[model samples]
Target chain A: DLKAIVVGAGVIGSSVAYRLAQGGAQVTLVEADRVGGGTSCVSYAWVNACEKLTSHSYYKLNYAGRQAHEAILDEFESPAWYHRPGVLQWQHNDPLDKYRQLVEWGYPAELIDARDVRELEPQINADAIGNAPVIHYPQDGWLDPTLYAGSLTEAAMVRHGLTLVRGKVAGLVVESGRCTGVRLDDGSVLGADAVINCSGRWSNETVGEGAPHVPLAPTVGLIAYTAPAGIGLRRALRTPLVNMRPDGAGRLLLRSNELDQLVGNHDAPALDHPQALELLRRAEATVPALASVGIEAVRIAIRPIPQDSYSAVGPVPNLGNYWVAVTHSGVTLGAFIGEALADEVLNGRPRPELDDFRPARFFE
Target chain B: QDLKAIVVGAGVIGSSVAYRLAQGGAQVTLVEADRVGGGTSCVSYAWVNACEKLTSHSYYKLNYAGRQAHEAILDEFESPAWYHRPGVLQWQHAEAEAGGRDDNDPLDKYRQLVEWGYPAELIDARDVRELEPQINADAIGNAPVIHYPQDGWLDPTLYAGSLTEAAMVRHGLTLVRGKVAGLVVESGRCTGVRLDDGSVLGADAVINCSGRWSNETVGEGAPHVPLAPTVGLIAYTAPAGIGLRRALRTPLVNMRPDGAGRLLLRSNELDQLVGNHDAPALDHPQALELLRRAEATVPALASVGIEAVRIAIRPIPQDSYSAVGPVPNLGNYWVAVTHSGVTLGAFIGEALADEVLNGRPRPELDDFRPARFFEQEPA
Candidate 1:
């Protein structure tokens, strides 16, 4: 019906703009860095709802997010970045107990013993698979983060006639206490009816000097990549100390929970490289075939989450025509969040499912 | 009458404490199961940051005090060889280019130090590169980076030996080298240590400075301080002569000079590289991973060769904080065991010596007592 401007060119910002454009709203997208160059580029990009353990509604919301990816595949078409099959994860202990826990929650899970583990993972080292169990979730998937982001952004611009502004957002412009638009990295203003702050880690920073308060905390984790070795395993695997998946090509994406403890919000990026290497070493041990792999890249990825470790979404309270969307599990939640936020912005129909993650909760 | 004290485990902390005890005129005998400075102490990154994962005001105060003690050490026995404090530069987000924008938040941490009156400055990319010239300018762009002038690094392998040498010459300290078999506990009092040869050395007090292995060295009969040590790996490069002087904390790796012509690389990735059998030298894909990571961060590292990889344990107390103070029941047995030995070495040395020799410990170490770990068990 009108015009909108989206700040930040990450997967969330890109896909969100795509949804809005498809909804017949003229959207203007803003990016500080190259498209998909921030957290989206360096992310593990594993699609799973298993992390939302304590809450049911959040799990369902994430489940819908994972399901929403299927719609993306059908509508947008699978590019080099899109790959869907399943994931393979193994913990130190047997997966039977953990599988039963997932079953209690009615989520699909499989109890794969050491015997079944070999059938799924042919190149796995028998020495590394001791009493530790393995769990298989068919829904867990992965994507080439840059490719997905770049493709989605291009489609939105070409098909829906969305304008792309290659610039940084210095500050937001408001007049008479009503939301207007953003001031660019260079001094210039572009007007809009509503402005969505999809600026990832800096979402709150874009709010400006005064009343620029957003309860967002940054979470950092290390991710390592291999240089196109023939990795046999197709599904994403979470070993004792390493969480890894194939990068659709021969290059494998590697990470681990054991390694995440080393990452602090204030920690330096260079601090995680050794950890990334160590994770690679552990991955080689867990899966014997990866012994010959060489690391192609390493990065300390930063994820945005509200202070309470939950999603912060919806219209900014007390501020007119301003909305916010930022979260920790962007890969799992990005697709569904894009569609849901679009519905709220265009049709004024707020999704009841996102009630628990309202932005106003932090404002008050 | 002379006071005879046995300082077990000739690590950096053990050596520093022994030096202090001997300096305080206690007849000190230093003992080690292996060569001196050969445990986790030698493998430490040795960067002294007063606020490394520290939130409590008291601990922060102690850390800053520790830095002050280091400054004193340099002024007296200072060698440009092992110690250098040019400050450390850190950035949280390396890829994002922003002008102190929302996500490039270092001010929150700066504010934490603001009330404490510790000096911290947030500098731009130009200033960051100008201050440390070798760092790739494009990698950081215009991100918000904070610098702490008080922080620095120590080459532990050199520092440990230096402290011991000073103790021997100036303090008349006796150096004992042997494999310790057990602690000599007589009537709930630790008199001395029993060697592998089954011979015992008697003492008025015994200080367990065995680090990660302290829990085992004390045995079941003696009161022991429980330890939970995290594993870490360190890689040394073949004198790459990379243009790096000050310590750097980038988003992916933490690096400092080895006090040699090479760069020493450490990172959170060490967590993934855990499971070392305490080797002097080990090479694997993991070591290669670290070398490759360094190459990525500092482009010049690609032309260099990895000299060695050493796996060691970070001797953390069971509760994951620094544990110090005396064991309540064990009359003469005490522990100065904790991680970040280089950071706390200066403070621990003087504080522990006063408590061991003069029956007084500083109020700073009150909360970090070894007794805190035993609180869950019925006393």
Candidate 2:
């Protein structure tokens, strides 16, 4: 019997395996596809705490993850797969009241004038200058999350002696009112002392017949890349719903409307042309040269989101050795969530942070 | 001021003409509807190859002149336009059945290129592999090649921008931000252009360098000139570490830009341009098909990420030669339109400026005369 069997190799699953291996647990990581092929690979990879409202549970979780990330980097001797270029948020609409409210609530942000914004990113559109506030946070930047996840998986396999298997989990091998092991797609079963369902969008399917009440909704998002305009905006720039990150490869990754309709398949988000075009027009307004840059490609991916749109972590209610950790923003909170689950399962300790996210809260 | 010369468009061709005309003491007003270097000039694969010509003597002479002109223009630009010394490779098949020649014949075009100042050689598959290590050896075995050293590209937008900047700063040329809605003509004589903003730029002479939209810009003022717009697409990839120093060309007409890690497939099986503007918004099914074909042409390019795909309509004249000089019916109206805008921009600009300012036409300007198109038409 293994100490932990991680049923996915995505960023969240890899984080779980890494944490388990660090805790001296013999971990077996199973993946449906190659490492970094899912939504984790296609993520915007924003290492940000900007979206977290103050006093919210996610705000604390984000802060803890940020701290753990610093520790992980110190251990790994690498740069933690992140850059600390400040995120410049240029307000387009009338969101000044909300911005001030966040500022009053202790969010680390500074308001700068249009001239200062010009000093920050010289290529910004002159028309974006107004009485509107410019919020700047020094901690936020971008990283290739896929690379970070892959690196963690490699470290777990090489340093921690974790075994990684590639196959789809058929179902949980539950018997005698307890989760025993996981069955593979090939009709093979591997016994595990404890099973962690980190299968992202397919988490509900991994739950099998034992836990029929687990609520998982797949949220979809679309991203587009434009022709390289050579405008030379260094930092990641955001304008409310639209964000542009100048990727290390020089192409800008433009993401429009963070939340919207799922459209056709819940698995894949449909390209919202008008929304994308509006974002492109906004980007062009920011950097006038972008008007000439052509749209190169567009892609959409779905993320496994909880019913509350927050992370769903810890053991299932009335089930032994069966655990689940899922989140919409798992890319940001994976480390903290993994550590929380480890403490609860291994030490039999209840974490206070898991109050709202607990499986018991959803029990009938 | 006794002189008023209106230049349409702000592409390399138009900007070049404005620069030269301003130098010749003609009060120049350069009109661009969009930002300067915003059209085909910004997106062109600015290849300056003298040997990329038809086998005819006139075409060879014209191309040679164009090559010299490009070198002269390069001297004026401040920024290095990513120009390199790597030559072009013209491929020829090996098997006689595959159109390969055994004996060195003087009548051959490749032989003629060797006689002229450029370097030409028939290399075997082994030699080709030794030259370009990344190219598929099996594919190289089926072809011979002619190498020319004086072949390269300039960053089209930067080069054009620098020329425009120089004209603005040094020559006191006025660049107005407005479109030419219609040509202002009186009794069969071109006078000026009416802009989109309900204003007129009264000029003694007008030069049409509006590229693909030259027909619409000139309107009924120049009825005889035929502008056939052909759209060409090129894909750019992210920079790869593989050091491909020279501009490589294949028998399949694929060209790789020097140091840019981009493999350009020029000849594909699809119709080049869709007739309407909305067609570009739709997913280009042909582009995807060409991407699959690109792997077979150059195996190393398979690893390069698809960074961008560009489409631009090039204006081709009736006789295939460039249409240059003033229109005969409209005394002061000039038209400089060509498929090879980047290659011949500076030369045509210089020729047009001389004709407008001093009534002196360059010796090679006779072949590219706009009247030639009218002469060939069934009137």
Candidate 3:
């Protein structure tokens, strides 16, 4: 019998599996497909601390997670997977009150003038220097999400002896009103003392029947790639037209949230013709040279978003040996949730900070 | 003045006709608007498959016959045409599986092909991974694949250039570098064509292979056949060290000619073309969207770095079929227009020559007649 079964092999599931295994739980990680095939692999791989707004208590929580990432990377020696080249959120608009709030909170950030912005990233369009204030965080950058999840899975398998089963879990195996194991599509049942739902958007489905919790909303986001426009920028650049970064591999990566609604459906066929052309047009505008840059390809992936657009963690209502960990800020909150979930499962006590995100909040 | 046939548009199809007509002892003049093979014939997917042929038989048989003919033609030419027998692999995904039979559908297609004498096989996803590990197995899903080993690819543009050289130098065929502005008709019979410089050349027969511009050229004399022009963009990437040996294709994408990691991305959207030939441009905003999409499809490409992006307009007929053979009531006027101009160049060329010089109806071309589009109306 296993201590727990983790559904989904994305970064979240992999992180939970690692923490559970390290906490002396025999964990079984089951994925519908191979590891790192979903949104985790396709993410722009940005690790930003600006996600923590001082107005919310989650600010400290995000900072804590960001601080722990350095220690976590020390365990994983891969170079391209984790990089800290610093981040600059060039403010095209005036600095909001939140900027001052962030500075007062002791966050490692500074306000720079247009000349400083040019000094930081010379290739930025000079027109971007309007009345907006640029916020520069020297410690922020990107990490390859796919390689990060892959390395974590590799370490868990080799160092902790975790079992990885490649199959889709059709439903949960419950007996005598208690969760026991997972039922796979192949009709095979692997018994577990407890079951952890880290299934991302499919978390509600994996829990089965009448579990009490907020419904997970899957938000689809599209990312575009462009030929390197020969703009020499060592860090990530963001304009209203484009979010450009040299993706370590030399090609410039451009992404924008504005084009999210352009993709009518989150399927392969819709991604074929019309959507592909729309993305190309957007890329050529920011870098005129891309008009001749041969387009390589395009893809659309659905990202899991909670109803409140915040993290969800804690035991499910009236379900024994079953817990749920879902979050909107997956990339930043991944390691934090892993540590938090491990403490609850191992110590039989919940962390006080997780009370706001308790699944019971939906019931009330 | 003594030419029996003047083939315009020195693409693979035009050169092939010229080569064959000259071989049959007919004085041929091959006229080109630009350098030989400088049109759509140069930019093609180049997978010679008989199953995909309009005849509805195993693609292997049709491609094999065509391959033999192409090789024979290449041997007689002094300048070499680039042709190689690389296998093509069509990957399967979830959509292909909904029809039933876990991996055998593509295999069945391959079996039907093999029975017709083409070397092909159906390989499992695991086997596919073992052969080409760089592909995303999860995205491809668990669908079976058909591998056609004997069917090959060729640089149709190079083949056209080579064949034109043979026609002009070896076979005593005339070469004219001028654009035909209008057709000359006398006594209800097409007599010759008028050049842009107002020069006229008389010929017994005229073949039009003007590619995307074919509609405009034919519209002057015949009722316009509706042809939709689709603009597509492809990006090139510097080769990564991973030696991808054979041509690879999924249901949505194809990579050929030793990809050298020189990745080409395509979009079948008509709006991607932003300007006319005088001032052409790629929709930059769309280019960015395509880049993000490419990163999602091939995560490994995130590291290869995009080298270039190019857009080309392709002509798509209404019925999605090629138009070959002569027009009804229009004596001595022939049309050889198709989307697969590169893949079927050699075959189309040989057939067109037989129709014009030997006065034989091309049997395989009965289905692709221009008359099919105007059967109810007069030409």
Which candidate leads the pack in TM-score? Answer: 2
Alpha-carbon deviation at A70 in model 2, angstroms:
29
Docking class of 2: incorrect
Residues B1-379, model 2: lDDT tens digits: 6478999987878977998998888889999887666778765667765565644466557667877887776676432333445666656531111012333332375667767765566666568755555466666644457666557665555455556656765777887778898888898888899987768889999999998888888666675568666666665543332224456655444555422233444442243443435243323665555555555655544334544556777777866667887776677888888877777877878988998888898888677778876655556
Candidate 3 stretches greater than 4 Å from native: A52-54, A91-94, A210-213, A227-229, A267-284, A287-291, A306-310, B1-379
Kindly report the fnat of each predicted structure, to 2 decimals: 0.00, 0.02, 0.00
- lDDT for A104 in candidate 2 is 66
Question: What are the chain A TM-scores of the candidates, in order?
Answer: 0.92, 0.88, 0.90
lDDT per residue as tens, model 1, A68-149: 8767877653133445556666665235655776788777677677777666555567666676666777656675545456
What is the Cα-based lDDT of residue A108 in candidate 1?
A: 69
How far residue A354's Cα lies from its native spot in candidate 2, in Å, is 36
Runs of candidate 1 exceeding 4 Å displacement:
A1-364, B78-80, B93-104, B278-283, B375-379
DockQ of 1: 0.01
Looking at candidate 1, what is the lDDT of residue B318? 71
Rank all candidate structures by their DockQ, best first, as comma-separated numbers: 2, 3, 1
**Candidate-wise lDDT, in order:** 0.70, 0.66, 0.63
lDDT of 2 by residue, A247-286 (tens): 4323467875543362334333223465455567767776
The TM-score, computed over Cα atoms with residue i paired to residue i, of candidate 2 is 0.56
TM-score of chain B of 2: 0.88
Model 3: per-residue Cα lDDT at residue A334: 73
